[PDB]
């Protein structure tokens, strides 16, 4: 994660275990980051979180890993089928 106008150097980084694809962002504010896994599961990272309880390194730079993936509690929504695309659906009018 980096910005066009910022100087050289990534601003943030997210990490996962399996192949990540089908990535998108939150359209209202930077609260969540979404991605579809190659093996059909869904993940989302908490963007609006301070840097703590994450492995850091010198030269400082700090990584960030935090999500509860659909890999945990079993359900049907996974359908055990690779994902193709994800998109934020701004239809909440309830």
């Amino acid at each position: 994660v980096w910005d066009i106008w910022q100087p050289s150097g990534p601003q943030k980084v997210l990490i996962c275990e399996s192949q990540v694809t089908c990535c998108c962002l939150s359209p209202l504010k930077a609260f969540l980051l979404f991605a579809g896994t190659a093996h059909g599961s869904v993940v989302v990272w908490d963007l609006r979180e301070d840097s703590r309880l994450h492995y850091s390194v010198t030269l400082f730079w700090t990584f960030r890993t935090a999500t509860f993936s659909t890999d945990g509690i079993l359900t049907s929504v996974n359908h055990r089928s690779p994902l193709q695309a994800v998109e934020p659906i701004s239809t909440s009018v309830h």
């Binding site: 935090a66 999500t67 509860f68 509690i73 049907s76 929504v77 193709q84 695309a85 659906i89």
Partner: protein, 87 residues
């Protein structure tokens, strides 16, 4: 059950069907794109060279498919879908 953080889950679920007109006999999709204006509308493309239309709320508004002025099949295997960001 969760990670050892302060984060939401995935208890909510809704499921919608597709490929009713398209469907060995078992077909698949390749790409989906929703409508920025009314995000309830969307289209889905398939390898068979066709793109279907649908929505979420009223599933009988215009259940048509998109096709060029061609005949036969032409399974061009559509791989990128986008939307013109204008009125």
């Amino acid at each position: 059950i969760s990670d050892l953080g302060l984060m939401p889950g995935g208890r909510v679920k809704l499921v919608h069907s597709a490929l009713i007109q398209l469907g060995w006999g078992t077909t698949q999709t390749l790409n989906v794109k929703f409508l920025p204006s009314d995000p309830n509308h969307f289209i889905i493309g398939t390898d068979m060279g066709l793109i279907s239309h649908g929505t979420r709320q009223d599933l009988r508004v215009a259940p048509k498919l998109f096709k060029p002025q061609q005949h036969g099949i032409r399974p061009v295997k559509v791989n990128v879908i986008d939307f013109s960001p204008f009125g």
